[PDB]
Design a protein around this ligand. Structure first.
Ligand SMILES: CCCC(=O)NCc1nc2ccccc2[nH]1
Length: 165
């Protein structure tokens, strides 16, 4: 199962890890992607997860959007986890860099409650522009299921742990 995680709360765990490397090692039931509404996995966590699937995630995602249209900001969809996980839960956190409502971050984290255990990044962090300290706070105050957070950046991981209330 998951190893080397620091326990933050009853159900939230954290580790300084590359989520792609973590997914390839654990092969969890669910890996969360930091998706956008179009499921265009160009960069950040999404670009990295998609590249690890040899673009199979993007081919599947394009078929999903052709059938269903875009997701909502704060919404999600369950697709294949390919070589990374049984499933990928594509969750759209608000992109502050595109002027989206930060208040939608709680709605985005609520999607995690439909899964007993997840490997996930901090939603709306990184290239999505939100404060990762705030994202972690919303995560611990919203997610009730078991969430294993992978934080790519060591310096950010240390800041998140050392500032955790
Ligand atoms: C082959 C190793 C995996 C890989 O593609 N690393 C690049 C990378 N990992 C990230 C994690 C979070 C956000 C952006 C990331 N970019």
């Amino acid at each position: 199962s998951f190893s080397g995680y620091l326990k933050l709360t009853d159900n939230v765990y954290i580790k300084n890890a590359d989520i792609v490397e973590e997914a390839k090692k654990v092969k969890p039931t669910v890996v969360v992607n930091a998706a956008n509404v179009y499921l265009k996995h160009g960069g950040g966590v999404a670009g990295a997860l998609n590249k690890a699937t040899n673009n199979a995630m993007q081919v599947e995602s394009d078929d999903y959007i052709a059938t269903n249209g875009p997701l909502k900001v704060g919404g999600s969809c369950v697709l294949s986890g390919h070589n990374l996980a049984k499933h990928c839960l594509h969750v759209v956190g608000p992109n502050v860099n595109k002027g989206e409502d930060i208040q939608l971050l709680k709605s985005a984290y609520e999607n995690f409650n439909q899964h007993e255990v997840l490997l996930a990044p901090l939603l709306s962090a990184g290239i999505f522009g939100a404060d990762p300290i705030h994202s972690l706070r919303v995560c611990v105050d919203t997610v009730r299921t078991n969430v294993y957070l992978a934080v790519f950046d060591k310096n950010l991981y240390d800041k998140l742990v050392s500032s955790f209330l």
